[PDB]
């Protein structure tokens, strides 16, 4: 997150996982990122497209978070790192990132955790609120409409 945009990684394209193999277990024990092991420094750049576990990347600009009042949007009051967000593609962008938008009632946060990913799951309560069931604490999000 920053003050101007949010960076995401694409996990599924129309209810189909992308890629099929996520690379889990390729780096051994512990909790490691896909490119955080020993094989990342010995990948053959000139004989393949990308390395094991690489995904498409996207960018959500603050002016694309919603369709109205798109000059007073606070990014940290909408998303947090680690959230699962449903978005729609606007443009192919450059070779690094797509461009995405959430400016519709069915787009936004679908899964989130309390304490910035250290706690349990929360459930959506209002258009701009989620609630923790174990302790009745509330946080601000841009909730995608359920049901």
């Amino acid at each position: 997150l920053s003050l101007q945009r949010a960076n995401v990684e694409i996990l599924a394209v129309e209810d189909k996982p992308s890629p099929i193999d996520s690379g889990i277990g390729s780096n051994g024990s512990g909790i490691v990122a896909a490119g955080g092991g020993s094989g990342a420094a010995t990948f053959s750049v000139s004989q393949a497209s990308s390395d094991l576990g690489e995904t498409f990347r996207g960018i959500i600009r603050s002016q694309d978070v919603r369709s109205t009042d798109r000059d007073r949007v606070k990014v940290i009051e909408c998303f947090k790192p680690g959230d699962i967000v449903r978005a729609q593609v606007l443009s192919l962008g450059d070779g690094t990132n797509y461009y995405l938008t959430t400016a519709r009632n069915d787009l936004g946060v679908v899964f989130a955790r309390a304490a910035n990913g250290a706690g349990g799951l929360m459930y959506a309560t209002d258009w701009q609120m989620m609630t923790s069931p174990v302790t009745g604490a509330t946080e601000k999000r841009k909730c995608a409409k359920p049901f």
Partner: protein, 657 residues
């Protein structure tokens, strides 16, 4: 796609967006009704008729519809005043300001900016334009200039199709053409609304020998018998017992609020000083004014509040007397304006700039004389200027009529000149389209673009100027720009050829940054004073004076060899004393309290700050020329000079914010 001229409201608009505690005029109702239908409106009504009601209603409509509004004025002076007025008037609407100096609340729903700011914003393609519903142009009749004309037309052309327009101005001969052009270019319906007459009437009087003679009534009908009696009773300039003879006659008539127009910076101070033993504050107004002044000037540094101008203004303001001219600091000028707007000043001596813009009306307007000196000799006032000055005399509601007094100083005035000045159709101004060497050099670098065929839609002059440029090796025989011409293309202010010759002659290579900026003030200060120059400057900075004068003299001989007509500024260059400000600039850069500087400077505090401000552009141009020729020694010298002439007082915040 057409312009329409127009000349059951309660049922038509049962739910108005805003309400006022008075009955609206017909033109206001028409403007409101046509704004409620979704059409653009052109309003051309007389002064002090209530044009700002339309803008307030537009802002209220935008707030109700949750859209944005942009307000634009040609003059940056009016932006701050309108910002303060709108901030006071509206409490539920966020107000913002965007100028070349400040930027407050860019995300607000109501924005006030300048035309060039909007031009740059449109060029950048800002995202806030998509939400804009109304754009308001105030004081349209002041945009008929050359520099103000192109930007306005470009802004009008570049605007998108979902933006509606509101236009406000005065009664001018060219009114239907602007609306027709806008409605043709944008293919929108716009209605032209005009008012019959002034809501408050004005009268013209003549003062002679301790009484006032009404000579024109409220119907603009001349009275010959009164003028004849004025001629009979009188059978030069003001005396030391003249302004007291007027400040008491009008005081007893309950017509006290007075604005006197004197066409001289120095004469206003003398006239104000001649008023001795006159007061208007009894015991509490003085204390309130003292508190306001003390709080306002807190933003300055402690040693900058002792300047003689501030002390004199404070002493005068405690009695209800003030002056308004271009020789004051901006803070003092805006302080005087704010105090005048609060009804604390009774007598004001003002220059011509007060009438232009500066929405601060009064009750009485007195003309010291009907003639003024504008550059080249004396000239009787044009009817347009007289109408502009005299029109600021009747405030709606608080006044039943507007009084105007024309003085007569122990000498009768001709009646034909009076009739010509007061009665007559005003004429729109025009420009002679001066041709400069920078324009010619810039046009020669453009691929294709046959120059001669565009000048027609000046030709004998263009050929003569090309011969000069080829003689001094700015261009070659095929009219290709050389290295010398490229430098001159980047110098815009006043003197391209003389400055270029100076730079390429290894001048400025021996002096220090403090001395370089001191010598360059000759191109900024016009030397209209007559006071003695400093007899001693330094052993150096006097050789620099001789070198500049010799180079200018050599360039002047080349101009006369080719028989080129010369402007007044260029002809009388060495005749004026344009080197008088070297010492002031030299000590400013060296580091010296601005109070000690004013003890020896030949110009007021307001003039000194203007000179330093104009010297910022000169340093930028010389820095650019150093990159073109590849002299890094000159580049670092000019960078140091810029940092040496910056002080806190030149960046003082406005009192309107």
């Amino acid at each position: 796609e057409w312009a329409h001229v127009v000349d059951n409201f309660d049922e038509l608009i049962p739910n108005p967006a805003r309400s006022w505690p008075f009955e609206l005029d017909t033109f206001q109702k028409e403007a409101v009704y046509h704004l409620e239908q979704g059409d653009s409106v052109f309003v051309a009504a007389h002064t002090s008729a209530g044009k700002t009601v339309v803008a307030e209603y537009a802002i209220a409509m935008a707030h109700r519809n949750m859209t944005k509004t942009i307000y634009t004025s040609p003059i940056k002076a009016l932006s701050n005043q309108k910002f303060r007025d709108f901030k006071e008037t509206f409490d539920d609407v966020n107000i913002g300001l965007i100028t070349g100096d400040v930027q407050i609340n860019p995300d607000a729903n109501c924005l006030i900016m300048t035309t060039e700011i909007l031009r740059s914003m449109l060029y950048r393609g800002a995202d806030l334009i998509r939400d804009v519903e109304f754009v308001i142009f105030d004081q349209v009749h002041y945009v008929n200039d050359q520099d103000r004309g192109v930007v306005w037309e470009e802004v009008i052309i570049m605007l998108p199709q979902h933006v509606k327009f509101i236009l406000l101005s005065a009664t001018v001969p060219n009114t239907y053409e602007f609306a027709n052009w806008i409605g043709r270019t944008k293919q929108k319906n716009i209605y032209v609304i005009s008012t019959p007459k002034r809501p408050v009437p004005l009268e013209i009087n003549i003062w002679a020998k301790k009484e006032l003679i009404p000579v024109i009534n409220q119907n603009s009908e001349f009275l010959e018998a009164n003028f004849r009696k004025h001629k009979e009773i009188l059978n030069d300039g003001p005396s030391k017992k003249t302004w007291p003879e007027i400040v008491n006659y009008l005081r007893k008539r309950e017509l006290l609020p007075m604005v006197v127009f004197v066409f001289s910076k120095k004469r206003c101070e003398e006239y104000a000083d001649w008023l001795e033993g006159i007061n208007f504050c009894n015991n509490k107004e003085k204390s309130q004014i003292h508190m306001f002044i003390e709080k306002s000037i807190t933003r300055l540094k402690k040693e900058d509040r002792d300047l003689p101008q501030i002390l004199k203004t404070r002493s005068l303001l405690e009695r209800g007397i003030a002056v308004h001219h271009g020789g004051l600091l901006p803070i003092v000028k805006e302080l005087i304006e704010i105090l005048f707007s609060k009804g604390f000043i009774k007598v004001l001596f003002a220059t011509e700039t007060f009438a232009m813009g500066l929405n601060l009306p009064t009750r009485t307007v007195i003309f010291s004389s009907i003639r003024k000196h504008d550059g080249n000799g004396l000239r009787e006032l044009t009817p347009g200027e007289f109408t502009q000055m005299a029109g600021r005399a009747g405030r709606r509601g608080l006044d039943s009529t507007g009084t105007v007094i024309v003085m007569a100083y122990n000498s009768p005035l001709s009646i034909a000149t009076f009739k010509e000045v007061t009665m007559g159709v005003p004429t729109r101004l025009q420009s002679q389209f001066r041709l400069t060497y920078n324009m010619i050099l810039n046009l020669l670098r453009i691929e294709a673009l046959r120059v001669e065929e565009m000048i027609k839609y000046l030709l004998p002059d263009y050929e003569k100027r090309l011969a000069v440029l080829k003689d001094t090796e700015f261009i070659d025989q095929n009219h290709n720009v050389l290295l010398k011409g490229r430098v001159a293309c980047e110098i815009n202010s006043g003197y391209e050829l003389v400055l270029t010759e100076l730079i390429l002659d290894n001048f400025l290579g021996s002096f220090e940054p403090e001395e370089i900026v001191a010598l360059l003030s000759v191109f900024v200060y016009e030397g209209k004073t007559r006071e003695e120059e400093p007899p001693i400057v330094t052993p150096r900075l006097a050789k620099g004076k001789q070198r500049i004068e010799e180079i200018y003299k050599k360039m002047l001989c080349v101009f006369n060899t080719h028989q080129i007509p010369l402007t007044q500024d260029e002809a009388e260059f060495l005749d004026r004393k344009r080197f008088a400000m070297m010492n002031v600039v030299y000590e400013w850069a060296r580091g010296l309290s601005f109070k000690e500087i004013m003890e020896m400077s030949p110009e007021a505090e307001g003039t000194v700050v203007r000179v330093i401000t104009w010297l910022d552009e000169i340093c930028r141009e010389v820095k650019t020329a150093s990159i073109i020729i590849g002299n890094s020694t000159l580049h670092m010298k000019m960078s140091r000079a810029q940092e040496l002439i910056k002080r806190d007082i030149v960046f003082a915040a406005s009192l309107y914010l």
